[PDB]
Amino acid sequence: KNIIIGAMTALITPFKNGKVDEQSYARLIKRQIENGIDAVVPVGTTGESATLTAEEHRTCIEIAVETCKGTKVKVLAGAGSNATHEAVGLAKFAKEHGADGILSVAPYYNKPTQQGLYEHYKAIAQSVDIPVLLYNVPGRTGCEISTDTIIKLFRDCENIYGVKEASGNIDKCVDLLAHEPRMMLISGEDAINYPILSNGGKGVISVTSNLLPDMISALTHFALDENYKEAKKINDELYNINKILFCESNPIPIKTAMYLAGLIESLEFRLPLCSPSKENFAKIEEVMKKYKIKGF
Amino acid sequence: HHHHHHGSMDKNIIIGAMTALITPFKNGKVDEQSYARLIKRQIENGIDAVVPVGTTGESATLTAEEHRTCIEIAVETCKGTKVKVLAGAGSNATHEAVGLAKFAKEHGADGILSVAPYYNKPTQQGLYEHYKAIAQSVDIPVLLYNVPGRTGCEISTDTIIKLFRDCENIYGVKEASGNIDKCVDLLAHEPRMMLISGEDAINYPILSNGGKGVISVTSNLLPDMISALTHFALDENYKEAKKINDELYNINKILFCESNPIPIKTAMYLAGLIESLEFRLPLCSPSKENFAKIEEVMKKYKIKGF
Amino acid sequence: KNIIIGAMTALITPFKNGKVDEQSYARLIKRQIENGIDAVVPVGTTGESATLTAEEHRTCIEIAVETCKGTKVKVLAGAGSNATHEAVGLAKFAKEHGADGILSVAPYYNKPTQQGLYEHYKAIAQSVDIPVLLYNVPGRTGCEISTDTIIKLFRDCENIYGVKEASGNIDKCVDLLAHEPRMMLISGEDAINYPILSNGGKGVISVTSNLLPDMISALTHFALDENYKEAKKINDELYNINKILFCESNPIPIKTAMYLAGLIESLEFRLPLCSPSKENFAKIEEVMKKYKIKGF
Amino acid sequence: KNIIIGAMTALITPFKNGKVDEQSYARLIKRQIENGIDAVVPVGTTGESATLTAEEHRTCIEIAVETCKGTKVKVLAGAGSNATHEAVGLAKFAKEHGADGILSVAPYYNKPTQQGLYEHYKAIAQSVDIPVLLYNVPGRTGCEISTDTIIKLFRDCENIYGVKEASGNIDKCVDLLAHEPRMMLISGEDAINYPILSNGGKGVISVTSNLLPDMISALTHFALDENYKEAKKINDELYNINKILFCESNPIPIKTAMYLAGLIESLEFRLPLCSPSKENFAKIEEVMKKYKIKGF
Ligand SMILES: NCCCC[C@@](N)(CC[C@](N)(CCCCN)C(=O)O)C(=O)O
Numbered sequence A, C, D: 001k002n003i004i005i006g007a008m009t010a011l012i013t014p015f016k017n018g019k020v021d022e023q024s025y026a027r028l029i030k031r032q033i034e035n036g037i038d039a040v041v042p043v044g045t046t047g048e049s050a051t052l053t054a055e056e057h058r059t060c061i062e063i064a065v066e067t068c069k070g071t072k073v074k075v076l077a078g079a080g081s082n083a084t085h086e087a088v089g090l091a092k093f094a095k096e097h098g099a100d101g102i103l104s105v106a107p108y109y110n111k112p113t114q115q116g117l118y119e120h121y122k123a124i125a126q127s128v129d130i131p132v133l134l135y136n137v138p139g140r141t142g143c144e145i146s147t148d149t150i151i152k153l154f155r156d157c158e159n160i161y162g163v164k165e166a167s168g169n170i171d172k173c174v175d176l177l178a179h180e181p182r183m184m185l186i187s188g189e190d191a192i193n194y195p196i197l198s199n200g201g202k203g204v205i206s207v208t209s210n211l212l213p214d215m216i217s218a219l220t221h222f223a224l225d226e227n228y229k230e231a232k233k234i235n236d237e238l239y240n241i242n243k244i245l246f247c248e249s250n251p252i253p254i255k256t257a258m259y260l261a262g263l264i265e266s267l268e269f270r271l272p273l274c275s276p277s278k279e280n281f282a283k284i285e286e287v288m289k290k291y292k293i294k295g296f
Numbered sequence B: 001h002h003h004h005h006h007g008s009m010d011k012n013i014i015i016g017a018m019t020a021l022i023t024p025f026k027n028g029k030v031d032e033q034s035y036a037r038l039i040k041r042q043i044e045n046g047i048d049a050v051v052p053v054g055t056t057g058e059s060a061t062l063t064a065e066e067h068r069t070c071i072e073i074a075v076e077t078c079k080g081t082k083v084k085v086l087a088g089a090g091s092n093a094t095h096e097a098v099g100l101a102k103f104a105k106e107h108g109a110d111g112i113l114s115v116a117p118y119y120n121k122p123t124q125q126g127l128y129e130h131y132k133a134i135a136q137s138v139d140i141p142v143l144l145y146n147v148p149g150r151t152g153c154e155i156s157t158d159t160i161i162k163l164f165r166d167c168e169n170i171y172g173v174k175e176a177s178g179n180i181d182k183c184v185d186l187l188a189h190e191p192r193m194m195l196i197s198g199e200d201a202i203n204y205p206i207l208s209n210g211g212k213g214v215i216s217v218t219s220n221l222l223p224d225m226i227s228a229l230t231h232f233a234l235d236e237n238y239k240e241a242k243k244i245n246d247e248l249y250n251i252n253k254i255l256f257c258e259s260n261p262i263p264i265k266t267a268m269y270l271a272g273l274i275e276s277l278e279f280r281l282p283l284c285s286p287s288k289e290n291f292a293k294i295e296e297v298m299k300k301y302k303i304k305g306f
């Protein structure tokens, strides 16, 4: 199985007067590349996929692809949808425009069954010839892709090689790798990056890496090298920032942090997302002071 | 300028018995003739409003144009009747929700249902700005829709009440949260709003506490019974409304043995009201067992034809 | 079926120098009797059953029975336990010492199965010849008596006549009365007293009635006569106090309120229960100022 | 800080004609000692603490202490209660009768506040001079000991040296050891034994070790010696039995499994606990066949 593993960053999408700041986007990706990241995930949840247009979604995948040219860094394009026909079209674009693989979030809102989830992902996997990573985040979607369903998709579909789990369920992470140790389990929750990696997980899709790419990449590579003592040391140091980056719904805190660090020019979201409370803004600023934030 | 005293300034409302319309498919396309036929069946069985392209209508898997087409069919079919059209117009992107509201307004809908943004989990402040933008975009009634099990977020009582008091067009909320405490909270602190049952099994408890209508899944199959229940309750004939609610519990529950609208479309097919049991992925046919369970609960109810 | 229904009070247990204030106990009960209450529940959750000795538990039931003699007010003695042998002994005491019935909470902590709950409650019901009201409160016990189990127990055991629900699950309350309308559904959550009664519930077991017995009494009796407009008005008026009385775990707020009203002489709990926060202490007092509190 | 760590067993309590089978109790403990176990926990949740009398509770601690005398295996006696006066009395007994330390579950059912939990545990720790391990299991108690409270108790009370966590919250376990790395985090959920140990947890209080003490022992010692690959190997191998041992509420499956393995004479519980369903009985049997069960 072709895989995409290692330290990965769920890229924020910087806005400038209600438009994608395409130049800042490429600059932010180069900063990720130059700080040891193994792959970038354009237009995921952290990238405000929901409020980007179809064309903007496609533009950011192209910017990510162009910027990682000449490096080893892969582009795991965000291509999920709660409509299978739409998710299939997004997978096909990502394949045809140079993405190395796709991240495909479990359908949100319409609550498909396990059978429907199976057919949803089978259709996506059959549409392309590049790796496909499932993404389970029941707190956001309202559904869950069961261990059995994930394992069936991994065994039945060539392209499906693992899952990004954001479910606060280390039991499930044992369950998955105990019954299908060949799959690539990817942490989708920064605070528990090390426990997932120490159980045989092979990478992270990180929010924190947007702000501290060197530390997340170092954490991941230590674990992948079975230096669990050094990996845990960074996970412990990062807990305070890992937690505060979710004091409000992601990506509200991480964008606040990127703005406070001078890495984006404006603290701009698209509704229904918004600036955090003044109190949480202040709390984010204070936590940041304990970490060394790389510039450009 | 903006002000905080809209609670008692005349609000156009859409209340009573309402149906979350299923969207029939035929060879992967919207069966538009069946759609209108189903709406006429609702009109002829005492329903007060229809909700095109909501959750039960598989809004998520319809194209933007199909979404718009079904609103137009709903509007056209309800012309000349007493039945209003509460068009599904929500989105988790505010830009998109605003455009959907504007379409519904410009194409004859009487109001819009606007579900809380799903998946991206806005804050209470974000939800406030989201609905303020929508309400300021059109001049037709806006019913908020809270269903946290599907969206991942909840519109708090405080936020709902703030929206009712701050925005002229926001007149109430459709609650699907299994939270009768919240329904007390809402109407005890802002009794002027229209609380709408979004959970068929608890239609009567919500109505008996001052709720003013239902947006029903069961009404797809049994429109006469849901409309009778609602009108009894609105007339304070709580004995007769509760009697129907209790009788409807078995079908009300089985219609969610799998994720709505999978069972209701199954039931509509078994009753001969739609010609094919067709969904759009990721939605699909139910299991055998649940198919049999739905068929078997249906045997207890008298299903009106066309 | 012999039943105990109507407006009922989960009595607080006042302490005085670490011992049960037996005179204040009787005085509080008389206050309930004189303000329209139909039954009292001695030594339930609100009475801090967990920290009373067997002798204090038994002493408090005797005080309730003695105080309601010659009145229309019944004693629904708290007699549950997570050990069936203990619950049987507790039921037998209440019967042999004049209680009109028993409330028996579902076993807490040890999480019996539905079969276990059935055998647990059958043993209790067969041990006595007085009514047995089940008590479902999953947030506290960690278990739930399913609708099927409650209905089976109601149909299989003569003396089991209903259930006190504290589960915030109005769907379940429809479920219960739609499929077994003969049972007595009792509200165990003050804020939703009216919704449960308006659906055919026949009483409440109230925390708020400790402080405002006349108001919970009028609410219940209005509703039982299908004067739903008057009952809903009191339920709506009571929401603020009904909610603040759970700003910390009951009975911490209600005992605080009883102390603030001068109805008990000490704000004394037994550990692990404790005084509320000073902030919540002030919040309870402010909510109370909006309500008409009867004296002795 | 005096500590009790390593591989520990929450001992089942076998019954014989409605009484504690005291001879089987000692033999089962002797089996644990002979398979590398570091300590035994008499009369915990798995030992049906809720339905034993005070004298049976006291008898089993004495049997545990006597049987581990002359060996290096310690006795961490179950001594919790939801009444602080009771929890102090049980702690005092355990010290006074030779236990090496006490496990004290968070008060169940009465839902103390964090302030109440602090005062509850402070009272327990001050009553004895032996180590005190907190036990957090919110699914059973209805309350949670917050990370702040655990750390505060650890820092303020000499005897409180850690916590046994049964909360399916690996985030909280990172939180605990990142902010207070000196405490002893003990796994209370067998399926996630390895992830908790690999993050710096120092032991387990196991249900599975009742049946497979050699495997749970090896798992813990592999991890404590930083052979994470071998510890993960047994954890993955043990998942099926770890999961099936909770298909019904613990200790219903483990006692069933011990009976099916011929390690106890009867499949006897105390109500409200009961035999499993025939289906789950069959499921436990089936899963067991894949594992090598040590005899006597
Ligand atoms: N990420 C780029 C496109 C965003 C589209 C959408 N906001 C909603 C997707 C949709 N299926 C659109 C249906 C249009 C009719 N309401 C949905 O709203 O569920 C999403 O995928 O979250």
Ligand SMILES: NCCCC[C@@](N)(CC[C@](N)(CCCCN)C(=O)O)C(=O)O
Binding pocket: C049, C050, C051, C052, C053, C054, C057, C081, C082, C083, C086, D049, D050, D051, D052, D053, D054, D057, D080, D081, D082, D083, D086
């Ligand atoms: N209700 C009046 C007496 C209170 C008894 C007890 N505190 C403890 C009940 C008990 N079964 C006692 C077991 C003794 C061994 N720990 C329990 O704690 O589970 C409770 O039921 O909450």
